[PDB]
Amino acid sequence: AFKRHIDRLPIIPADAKKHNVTCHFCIVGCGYHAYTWPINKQGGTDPQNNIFGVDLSEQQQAESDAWYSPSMYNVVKQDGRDVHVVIKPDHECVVNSGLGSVRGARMAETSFSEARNTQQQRLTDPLVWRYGQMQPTSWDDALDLVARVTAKIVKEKGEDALIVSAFDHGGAGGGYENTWGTGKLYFEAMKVKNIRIHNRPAYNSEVHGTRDMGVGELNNCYEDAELADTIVAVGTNALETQTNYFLNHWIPNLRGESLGKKKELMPEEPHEAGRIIIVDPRRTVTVNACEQTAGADNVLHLAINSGTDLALFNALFTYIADKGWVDRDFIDKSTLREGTARPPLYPARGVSEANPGHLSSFEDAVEGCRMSIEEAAEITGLDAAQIIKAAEWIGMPKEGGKRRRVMFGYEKGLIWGNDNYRTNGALVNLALATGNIGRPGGGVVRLGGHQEGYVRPSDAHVGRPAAYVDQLLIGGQGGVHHIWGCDHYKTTLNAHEFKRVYKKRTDMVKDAMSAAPYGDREAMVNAIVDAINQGGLFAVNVDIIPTKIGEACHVILPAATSGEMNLTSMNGERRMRLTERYMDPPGQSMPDCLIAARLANTMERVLTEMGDVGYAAQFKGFDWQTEEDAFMDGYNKNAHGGEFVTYERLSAMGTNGFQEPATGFTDGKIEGTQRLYTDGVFSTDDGKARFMDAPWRGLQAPGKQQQKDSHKYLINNGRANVVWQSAYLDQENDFVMDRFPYPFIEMNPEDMAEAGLKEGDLVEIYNDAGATQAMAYPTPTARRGETFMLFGFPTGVQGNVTSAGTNELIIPNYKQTWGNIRKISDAPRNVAHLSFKSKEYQS
Amino acid sequence: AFKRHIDRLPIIPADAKKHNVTCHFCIVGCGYHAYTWPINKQGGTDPQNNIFGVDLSEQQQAESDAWYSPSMYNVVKQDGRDVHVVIKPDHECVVNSGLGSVRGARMAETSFSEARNTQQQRLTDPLVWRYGQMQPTSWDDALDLVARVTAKIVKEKGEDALIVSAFDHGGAGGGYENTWGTGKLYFEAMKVKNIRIHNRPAYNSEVHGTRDMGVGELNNCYEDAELADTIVAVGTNALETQTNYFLNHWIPNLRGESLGKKKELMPEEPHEAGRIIIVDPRRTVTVNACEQTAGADNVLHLAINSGTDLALFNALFTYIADKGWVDRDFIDKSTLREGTARPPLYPARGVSEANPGHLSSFEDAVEGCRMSIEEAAEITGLDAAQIIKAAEWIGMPKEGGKRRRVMFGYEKGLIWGNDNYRTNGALVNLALATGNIGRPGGGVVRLGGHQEGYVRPSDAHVGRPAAYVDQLLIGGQGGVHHIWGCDHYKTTLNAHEFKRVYKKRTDMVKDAMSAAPYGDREAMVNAIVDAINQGGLFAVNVDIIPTKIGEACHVILPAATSGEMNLTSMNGERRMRLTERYMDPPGQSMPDCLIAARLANTMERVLTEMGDVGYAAQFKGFDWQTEEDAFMDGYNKNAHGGEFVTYERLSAMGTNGFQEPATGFTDGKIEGTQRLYTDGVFSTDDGKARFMDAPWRGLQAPGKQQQKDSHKYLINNGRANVVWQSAYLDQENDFVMDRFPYPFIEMNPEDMAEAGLKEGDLVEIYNDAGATQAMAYPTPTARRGETFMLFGFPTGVQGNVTSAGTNELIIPNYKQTWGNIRKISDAPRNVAHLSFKSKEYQS
Amino acid sequence: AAGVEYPANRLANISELTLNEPLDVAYPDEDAAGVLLKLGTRVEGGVGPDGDIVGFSTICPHKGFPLSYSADNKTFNCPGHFSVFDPEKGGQQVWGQATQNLPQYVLRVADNGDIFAEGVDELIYGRLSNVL
Ligand SMILES: Nc1nc2c(c(=O)[nH]1)N[C@H]1C(S)=C(S)[C@@H](COP(=O)(O)OP(=O)(O)OC[C@H]3O[C@@H](n4cnc5c(=O)[nH]c(N)nc54)[C@H](O)[C@@H]3O)O[C@H]1N2
Ligand SMILES: Nc1nc2c(c(=O)[nH]1)N[C@H]1C(S)=C(S)[C@@H](COP(=O)(O)OP(=O)(O)OC[C@H]3O[C@@H](n4cnc5c(=O)[nH]c(N)nc54)[C@H](O)[C@@H]3O)O[C@H]1N2
Ligand SMILES: Nc1nc2c(c(=O)[nH]1)N[C@H]1C(S)=C(S)[C@@H](COP(=O)(O)OP(=O)(O)OC[C@H]3O[C@@H](n4cnc5c(=O)[nH]c(N)nc54)[C@H](O)[C@@H]3O)O[C@H]1N2
Ligand SMILES: Nc1nc2c(c(=O)[nH]1)N[C@H]1C(S)=C(S)[C@@H](COP(=O)(O)OP(=O)(O)OC[C@H]3O[C@@H](n4cnc5c(=O)[nH]c(N)nc54)[C@H](O)[C@@H]3O)O[C@H]1N2
Ligand code: F3S
Ligand code: F3S
Ligand code: FES
Ligand SMILES: [Mo+4]
Ligand SMILES: [Mo+4]
Ligand SMILES: [O]
Ligand SMILES: [O]
């Protein structure tokens, strides 16, 4: 097991500088502080000599604010000088209450340090493909080349020849400054249609369903998870994927800690310890934790068949409506009453590709979705009794016939799950019918992935459905690709075919650049455009590390991330915070919004020189010199309630910040919105929510049923607790890579015995889409024929065996994947040190 | 300026484990010790508690043994535990006398550490190209793939289809164990013709010239540099490139420190302080150091024109002969007296490509070489009075008619210089004529590059001249390439064209392997061979880091280097030492010799399965389980005097070891050879040295005169004192990369001003062969029209502008390169922090 | 106890410094020879109103040879093995056998112009702890 052998840390001195830091990583947005002090200085054991005011010569007891781990300590550049830094979870943040996940708590250790030699992989310099390999160069030179090629191609073949892949998320690698910078460049100055997002291959929403129904997907507050009678958790592994929301808010509900608060905030109705329904085909550590804290009797794990959520939801909606277990008053006053005619091709297909489901009244949706317990048990594989109990835990009035309070949280098991649009609607149906939107203990919400920090111009030119960007590239279309803060080689669908063709097209342009003289920049640009005109691709990567897709790119621009820049973003309850810059960018690396600005400056200059003064003028309005200029040109001017928000005010609010939208500023406090839709006015023209007439139609994406029937195992996929995303930082972190040097594939031990596999064995997963590798991890809780592979991993990409298959709105159905498994090799030697024991906690 | 901010190092305890370590790096082979102790123990400041028996609470004075810098300290794995390690120069080693260079003093911080995060680039696992990128795998899997593709291709197309690039040098990435293991696989088990060496594109000697004459190139000891009357240093920058040989042995001579030892060892003649001739077109820090320690009076810097050494030497030879400043008895007793007829094609060409120079008597050579002082002055651009004075400093007798003692030293200014075979010969003529071989104060020697550690089966099958391997590869020949411990992408000649074609050919095999099923190995193998048959190349890289040529390779195998293994090598004195293992290989990396044995064992199995037991049996004799097995099978059985040398005996003799060849073993002491040719019997069938009839014939390599005539600047090239070789370790060492993030090109300030160039500017050097980049470094001492570019550097490869031009024996003529210089961009911001002052020390 | 505890020692006054003339100093004790130096230009680590006052250990980090200043090039020069250090660029080894750039002092200028050393950025020659 990897041990740091750091048996002593510098003590934070009492005059250390404090910065407010939101966690870089997941949706929960746990609060932290960065304490920096000069190298050559330290605090002392005595109370007046340390930031804690505490005698550090004494053992601290459990949950002490007066400790930190090695992973929280480092040395970084601040204003050109080496400083000590501790990045430490904030005890007074209501989000986390001093909790740090295995991810946030290693923010420090995953910061760039020359002095302590952490994350030396970090990009410090622009790189260009010339003289037979990648070569470092100046910003002026690299931007000039990107500008000249991008300008020539757009001018000869139109903006449709420019392909963009960019984050749209918050936190490190997004936020309001960065999305606005990128957004303004490609949507204001240009009208790029052929743009995709970090996690899906078109410019679409994850959740058009809930939005079309007029319910924004982040409509509750984290306290609602404390106040609910029942949590409904669909396609979420929250202990692993929303750790500190689960631990600091769901848990207190389940072991009865929130009872006092419930009785105080909601007197005149009964209250008992929260119960939880988990809809997930896989038994996760979350199911285990729930059983362990609430007792097995207060946990209903619906281990559905993969891709059968919609059947379950329709059946619950049907049962709940027939019983009259609904909020009549909420339905009559806040939802659409005027019935509406089913489209011609219903139920199999919606009216168009744009609108897969039928928006309607309560009564119409009940009749359209209508499904019996008997039918849903057959489809889902559940007992009738499990579906009835679930309807009871969701809908049955409490003693005195008081409405049951239910929080419905979903994530990627639904969103990357079967029939995204109708399944999303079917769940919202359940929350609308039970009046569990806009009220204490309620909500129908995305539990989320990244934090949120989206503000951009109109995207109306993109269309709906939007262009399937991967299929464009794979089919030889487009001339220039700008990639920002995503790595399709590890994370796109159909990733094997994607890499095969992406390598070929970028190689054509690499070969041309290697044979052309660079010193005559006009000859170079000509060779590149001539190769593009033969079906080649010129590819520009903006990132913080050498990416997998970067191995195929011609130009690489180094970015600075959260903590090396100021950054704004909101969490899963819309809690906006400012991360206050505590360190310098590594080398000449610069914030994404400013790279966007600098590139717009270069496009303007280059388009002037080419003649076209009209097109050149479109790249004006990018004179930003700090990220705060992006914030003020973007969020402040364009966000709902933006007028009330500045860095200075956000700073004052600290790691508790405020819940968007901001309603006012008064007495040095931004005034926020604790919950959306409390007045029962929804985000439609006429202010009523729509229900969804959303009948089950089996597996909806093309080839999916064929793939299931022709392959032996379900290749379920998703997150590990230890790993952050595509392991872009974790790959140079000995703590993580010591645990999983290969991606695990969780396999039933009987399934392993039958296939001749032992723990640690390198296996190939193969199907119609492609092939990949993983390390076999015996998992007693795995159902026979069902495996789970860690997604996005550099040493075995699960994406390689996902099909091109999407729903009508180009939503990648990653979770419904089936494949075969055969041994490549006996357990490699580098895996002998691994624990293969159960991840499930035991009493 | 990069600062470590390490205020304090652990004290080596009294009971630390001691290991004899020779420097990993240059020929000099400075003695060190590695002290290791448990991570949870340390030494005390009191004498009884540290390794020095000294009170460390008190400041130590200049040249203290009881100090070590931060770069000499790390934490490393030993028998699977973290230990402290200090790698310190041995004060008691006769080579260095406790000196460590800027290179050897950072052995510890260029070691692999998980705990202190040093050299995380180091390879831990076998990598195979599959699923669209490089993927870690098992040894068994990787070796099976390499062997199945190798066995199939040599079975189908012959051994001539297997191409090999491999180290032939000593120290780290070489040595007796590793040259033997690779040599036995490719020359015993097989008869590989199409093999090149790490620094030259055929299987040839750097110095056929001296060797054909019967003078092995390492014939003296380091003491002779202390005892010479004159040192003649030809195309050596010894202060940068042979640092502690210069500092610990040349300096004492030039300063008179040596006078006492001279008088004790050679009474019966006069002795003044040593003088020095430096033949180098460029004024180095070596010229400066010599002036500053012996005064300008005692230093003759002959700033010859590029590649005219042969003219200078023929004129010195002529002048010395005509004066009778020659050892008449040596010539008559120890050299060839028999006249022999010039070849028909003389003097333009030799008797063949194989023999470009004519071996003869003293008198035939003088008449052949015959050149006037006037003519050499024309060619060299020296003044007559410089050449005449150089003659006097070499030839003219001392007071009592006594012989002047002259050590003649050369390296890559000659060897990579014009007409390698003849220039090498012309220099040996001078040392032969003056009886300066096999006497105290004498020698005509390579000053060296790496340490030496060569033992291999016969290479008779390879031929002379041998195959120009790079031209075979560029011309689309060969199927499989095994690359061991070299990186042609940074260090070969004609490197731009090499990379253009190497990428296309390996790309063809990559596309095939991305498109084929891996888990079915036979189909993977057939897709590879079909791609090879279309003109592809399958490439295997054996290295310690991800190389530049490794970005084109299909299999990477991870090697363990010196210190992670026992390693034997000898210095430029033939001083053989054992480097004793002090640490563990990173991850699963294994010594090169054991990789060769494992590949041999796999070749045996694969060939047996294909049903060729006869070919399979050739791959026996590779049952080695440790590097010592390779030493005993190789050096012990095959080296001259090998039967006297074992690890145990070598260990007992410490960092002073013994000079090869070993003559016997007497009470715990291997007896060695201080000097070669002391009995005047040379390495020829009859025991006579031959002189060389070596007439000047201009720039002899094809296209060189054309390249001089058609380009504005000389692109001289070679070493920086800070940089070790191709910066394979240095590129992840902040100290080195802080100094030169770009390779410097030394340019005259007047030349820079005329070209609109300022300090730091990024410039393209381009010519007929290709193009590359460097950072302009203003150098007052540089002659106008004459630049010097750091070689082998990842961030700008000088090799790109070197032509394919070799001499008749396929020696690469790197140093005679001319190209044009244009600006790429203004000084990048990452050079702003650089010092641009003179490297020349000022009194 | 985790870090080295550096004394805040008085070295000189800003008034004691002549442009380009090293003032010989000891920090962090008597046996750690160094200099203060005004450079007449704004540079890395520089203090005082012009930001041109720097402090360096002046014992070669290679083998402990006392260094010597060249006023013409503004470089420390080692007569031991010919190392050159640039105190205009943070004491970068311009050429040399040290594995360290020249250990440099953390200077603070108080109101009266008294100059203080609070630490060193590299390991001083001949001590395994900067504070002994
Ligand atoms: N530790 C860690 N946390 C993270 C991240 C990370 O990389 N590591 N990344 C963040 C990001 S960007 C995101 S998007 C979120 C994702 O957070 P989650 O969506 O919670 O995580 P996943 O592992 O993608 O999938 C959750 C569950 O979906 C289940 N599932 C699979 N197929 C189906 C199906 O058909 N129906 C249902 N109902 N469930 C199904 C899986 O069994 C799995 O347990 O996590 C965020 N947090
Ligand atoms: N099979 C399967 N595939 C999936 C999923 C799944 O469940 N199953 N999940 C999908 C989901 S939900 C997601 S979120 C995606 C993730 O897909 P990606 O976005 O490709 O994955 P990340 O690892 O988050 O990629 C972030 C990249 O941005 C870089 N980066 C970090 N900080 C910065 C910064 O400040 N600026 C810039 N310019 N770059 C920065 C990182 O180094 C990294 O290369 O994967 C998707 N893929
Ligand atoms: N223009 C020009 N070109 C030149 C020269 C010149 O003067 N001018 N000089 C030439 C000369 S003299 C030389 S020596 C060559 C050098 O040419 P190369 O040999 O290509 O250069 P090195 O950097 O020594 O390469 C050593 C390689 O071996 C790897 N390595 C190190 N240790 C081990 C080990 O234990 N095992 C294995 N398997 N690999 C290991 C390193 O990671 C690195 O990739 O360059 C030549 N090229
Ligand atoms: N610091 C350091 N030391 C090293 C190495 C390293 O990488 N770094 N590598 C080692 C190795 S493998 C080697 S081979 C040696 C190389 O050691 P050297 O050969 O001493 O070094 P180079 O810098 O290659 O070239 C020596 C000199 O040749 C001169 N020269 C150029 N053209 C001519 C010419 O036509 N005639 C003459 N007479 N001189 C000419 C150059 O100006 C240069 O000063 O260094 C070894 N030691
Ligand atoms: S620490 Fe960070 S990763 Fe998520 S659970 Fe808290 S925000
Ligand atoms: S320390 Fe090493 S690099 Fe050469 S000069 Fe001595 S062997
Ligand atoms: S002590 Fe200064 S260079 Fe050796
Ligand atoms: Mo996500
Ligand atoms: Mo060499
Ligand atoms: O996401
Ligand atoms: O060499």
Numbering used by the authors:
A (entry chain A), B (entry chain C): 2 to 844
C (entry chain D): 44 to 175
Q: Please, what does the article write about this entry?
A:
The arsenite oxidase (AioAB) from Pseudorhizobium banfieldiae sp. strain NT-26 catalyzes the oxidation of arsenite to arsenate and transfers electrons to its cognate electron acceptor cytochrome c 552 (cytc 552). The electrons are then received by the electron acceptor cytc 552 (Bernhardt & Santini, 2006; Santini & Ward, 2018).
HARLEM analysis of the coordinates of the complex predicts that the dominant electron-tunneling pathway from AioB to cytc 552 proceeds from the [2Fe–2S] Rieske cluster in the AioB subunit to Pro122 and across the protein–protein interface to the porphyrin ring and onto the heme iron, with Pro122 at a distance of 4.1 Å from the closest heme vinyl group.
